[PDB]
Every structure is written in structure tokens, then in C-alpha cells.
Design a protein around this ligand. Structure first.
Ligand code: HEC
Length: 104
């Protein structure tokens, strides 16, 4: 994926609710640093729904591709209010950005 393009997607669709940096603050949504390889609902210090805590998958390219297409379908009852990104290339670019940003 294209990290530069992914950053712009993130800014447009995600950044209002999420930070990515190490030590970044929780906002409407949890800080996303360290997500890759982590189970759902594991950012420290954030009140997740039980739905997000219980989903139990490991975040990575495959699961992010599916989630980000339609978040509430993947985690019904989530309090993340975002309808999804339909396009596969846009999700891949966003996920490439996330892989860099959330592991710096
Ligand atoms: C606010 C209006 C949000 C927007 C826009 C996006 N997200 Fe979000 N996200 C938000 C909340 C409140 C939560 C917690 C949901 C709950 O039910 O507890 C989330 C969660 C995520 C997660 C899961 C994190 C984890 O399991 O630790 C991911 C991976 C995530 N959000 C990513 C994400 C991306 C990439 C977004 C733009 C496409 C995005 N979110 C938008 C709130 C909001």
C-alpha cells in the first residue's frame, strides 16, 4: 500500500477520533499505537464496549481489511461510528500507513 496516500485517508476519515503515536491521547476512540499483532480491545486505559473487547481477533492486514470495509458488521454494537471504506485500494493504503505510524 501507499503510505503517503494512507496518511491522507487517515486524516480525512479517522484522525478526528484517533491518534497513532506512542503516548498519543485517547479521544473519542482509543490511541492506536501498537495495534498490529494485538487482540481487540487492548489499548490501555480506554473504556471499550464489551463488543469490541469480546471480538477476540488479532489486528493485522487481513482483519483490518475486513473491519474497515464495514466496522459494525464486523463488531456489532461497537461505539465506533464510521460506516466503512468500500474501496480495497484505499483500505490497503490506509492499512500500510497504520502499519508504519502505529509502530514508530
Ligand atoms: C469516531 C467518530 C471514530 C471514527 C471516525 C473512527 N473511529 Fe475507530 N474507533 C472509535 C471508537 C469509539 C472505538 C472503540 C469502539 C468500541 O466499541 O469500544 C474505535 C475502535 C477502533 C479500532 C479497534 C481498536 C482496538 O480493538 O483496540 C480500530 C482498529 C479503529 N477504531 C480504527 C479506525 C480507523 C482506521 C478509522 C478511519 C477509517 C476509524 N477507526 C474511524 C471511534 C472512531
Amino acid at each position: 500500500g501507499d503510505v503517503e496516500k494512507g496518511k491522507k485517508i487517515f486524516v480525512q476519515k479517522c484522525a478526528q477520533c484517533h491518534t497513532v503515536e506512542k503516548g498519543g491521547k485517547h479521544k473519542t476512540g482509543p490511541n492506536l499505537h501498537g495495534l498490529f499483532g494485538r487482540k481487540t480491545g487492548q489499548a490501555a486505559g480506554f473504556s471499550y464496549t464489551d463488543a469490541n473487547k469480546n471480538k477476540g481477533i488479532t489486528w493485522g492486514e487481513d482483519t483490518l481489511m475486513e473491519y474497515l470495509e464495514n466496522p459494525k458488521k464486523y463488531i456489532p454494537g461497537t461505539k465506533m461510528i464510521f460506516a466503512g471504506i468500500k474501496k480495497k485500494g484505499e483500505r490497503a493504503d490506509l492499512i500500510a500507513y497504520l502499519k508504519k505510524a502505529t509502530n514508530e
